[PDB]
Amino acid sequence: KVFGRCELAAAMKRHGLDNYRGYSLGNWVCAAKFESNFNTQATNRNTDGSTDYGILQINSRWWCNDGRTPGSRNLCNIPCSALLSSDITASVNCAKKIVSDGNGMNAWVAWRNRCKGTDVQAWIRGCRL
Ligand code: NA
């Protein structure tokens, strides 16, 4: 599923991401835009053999099991394919665990390079919510 901007903002709000660990909703919408272009089916392979999955591009080296990242962890206790669903619940619940690990949203390279320090509330302007 490819989300609309306000459609995704509403879904993340419903799932409790607005101000989660201090990150306003616009941060999460900005991260999703540049990580995945709002596409729940996005995948990208990394140099170390791991793969990033879903609308927030969660990585198989630590957070999910894809059966092909040897010596990796599965800290969200979930198959990576669950991160590709049109239902974003699994992605949001796993992202809550990531952002709570000490490094905040710096875990998402696109957020650090393209959202951090910008007017992130622009990403939810015009939305009803
Ligand atoms: Na893994």
UniProtKB/Swiss-Prot annotation:
SUPFAM superfamilies: Lysozyme-like. In the egg white and polymorphonuclear leukocytes. Residues 1-129 form the C-type lysozyme domain. InterPro entries: Glyco_hydro_22, Glyco_hydro_22_CS, Glyco_hydro_22_lys, Lysozyme-like_dom_sf. GO terms for cellular component: cytoplasm; endoplasmic reticulum; extracellular space. One of its GO terms (molecular function) is beta-N-acetylglucosaminidase activity. It catalyses: Hydrolysis of (1->4)-beta-linkages between N-acetylmuramic acid and N-acetyl-D-glucosamine residues in a peptidoglycan and between N-acetyl-D-glucosamine residues in chitodextrins. Keywords: Allergen, Antimicrobial, Bacteriolytic enzyme, Disulfide bond, Glycosidase, Hydrolase, Secreted, Signal. It is an enzyme of class 3 (hydrolase). One of its GO terms (biological process) is killing of cells of another organism. Its EC number is 3.2.1.17. The keyword Hydrolase applies. The keyword tRNA-binding does not apply. Disulfide bonds join 6-127, 30-115, 64-80, 76-94. It is found in: Secreted. Lysozyme C is capable of both hydrolysis and transglycosylation; it also shows a slight esterase activity. It acts rapidly on both peptide-substituted and unsubstituted peptidoglycan, and slowly on chitin oligosaccharides. Belongs to the glycosyl hydrolase 22 family. Monomer. Lysozymes have primarily a bacteriolytic function; those in tissues and body fluids are associated with the monocyte-macrophage system and enhance the activity of immunoagents. Has bacteriolytic activity against M.luteus. This is Lysozyme C. It comes from Gallus gallus.
